[PDB]
Design a protein around this ligand. Structure first.
Ligand SMILES: O=c1ccn([C@H]2C[C@H](O)[C@@H](CO)O2)c(=O)[nH]1
Ligand SMILES: O=c1ccn([C@H]2C[C@H](O)[C@@H](CO)O2)c(=O)[nH]1
Ligand code: ALF
Ligand code: ALF
Ligand SMILES: [Mg+2]
Ligand SMILES: [Mg+2]
Lengths: 192, 193
């Protein structure tokens, strides 16, 4: 069997659109970063560069009760995970990291999966700050580089395209998925 | 080379069995109960069902309630051992633990228990999973009789941590039981160096 590890934020759940909508509702007078202009993984650091006090303002949006629970699905994501898990000789886990400020993040992620995908998918969640100690063939994740205690992880990292990484320059050794309407089946087939 | 040790929570760091009995005797004082050293088998709910059918839902209501996981007491010597272990040269520790199927009052409470008893540096070392066989390490210290999942041959050696429900088992000469945190765990780690 081929085991596929799938990230949540930026892959299944639209974190960036949720953050922007929440910031504009809470701070309606303030300048913002349009999604098309996002660069670098941590949104907070781009807001800090725009004006220093904006860093703590935008963090207050994603640290608030309800933020993770209310995120909208990425187009095609839920249907793709359903199809993937049903394929012969294929196993799926949802492998996701909590914030350091974990309080309103850990339980809300479990409930989001229960509502959008159902109870059977809740049993496939792995919560960890270090994905390199998880065994699998593939990791689908929008983070530029995924690191931890294992210098050479068991999995190949497939970069999932998101507003913040679209402009990032990659060598031919690093593979990219453009969206869930791109050819993910061929990637899985390369590990069989 | 570094030795990676995966450490379970219930029955190893936190006293689930004592907490469950205390809560049951408080909420259901008239009902029959199971004394700790009479426990047999991993799942307490099924021994209570065997005692009388109506007791299965009653004992489950105790461990599914708000505050149950948050309020568990530490196992003797456990917190000092994990601190000492994480401080050793060429040694790494993760707390590798599973949520209930009824996850609502379990997931967040386990994170807060670690924060309070061991601090923020240990919160970052939590791995939550229903399948421990897909986690890479040298040793897994866990009171469950057999730890199973998708990998038929896990990377880790399972060290059975002694608890009321498993005390009756006798291991063959090819395997190792840890009697308590005073039972020379350093020698077990040294076998992997
Ligand atoms: O700017 C941020 C900050 C956090 N996260 C997500 C990634 C991960 O799944 C979780 C914890 O870092 O929150 C983002 O996607 N963007
Ligand atoms: O009777 C039970 C039921 C659950 N758990 C613990 C084991 C695991 O860490 C978590 C989820 O099964 O709860 C026990 O220790 N005993
Ligand atoms: F859900 Al993530 F990094 F985006 F674990
Ligand atoms: F904390 Al456990 F099985 F007892 F994961
Ligand atoms: Mg992500
Ligand atoms: Mg246990």
């Amino acid at each position: 069997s081929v085991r596929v590890l799938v990230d949540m934020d930026g892959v299944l759940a639209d974190f960036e659109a949720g953050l922007l909508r929440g910031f504009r509702r809470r701070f309606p007078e303030e300048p913002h970063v349009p999604l098309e202009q996002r660069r670098g993984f941590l949104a907070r650091e781009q807001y800090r560069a725009l004006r220093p006090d904006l860093a703590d303002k935008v963090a207050s949006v994603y640290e608030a009760p309800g933020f993770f629970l209310d995120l909208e699905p990425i187009p095609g994501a839920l249907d793709a995970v359903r199809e993937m898990n049903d394929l012969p000789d294929t196993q799926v886990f949802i492998c996701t990291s909590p914030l350091l400020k974990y309080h309103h993040c850990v339980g809300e992620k479990y409930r989001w999966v229960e509502q959008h995908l159902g109870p059977q998918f809740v049993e496939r969640i792995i919560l960890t700050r270090d994905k390199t100690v998880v065994l699998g063939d593939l990791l689908i994740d929008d983070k530029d580089t995924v690191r931890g205690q294992e210098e050479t992880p068991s999995w190949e990292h497939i970069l999932f395209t998101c507003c913040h990484n679209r402009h990032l320059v990659l060598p031919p050794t690093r593979r990219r998925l453009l969206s869930w309407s791109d050819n993910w089946r061929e990637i899985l087939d390369s590990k069989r």
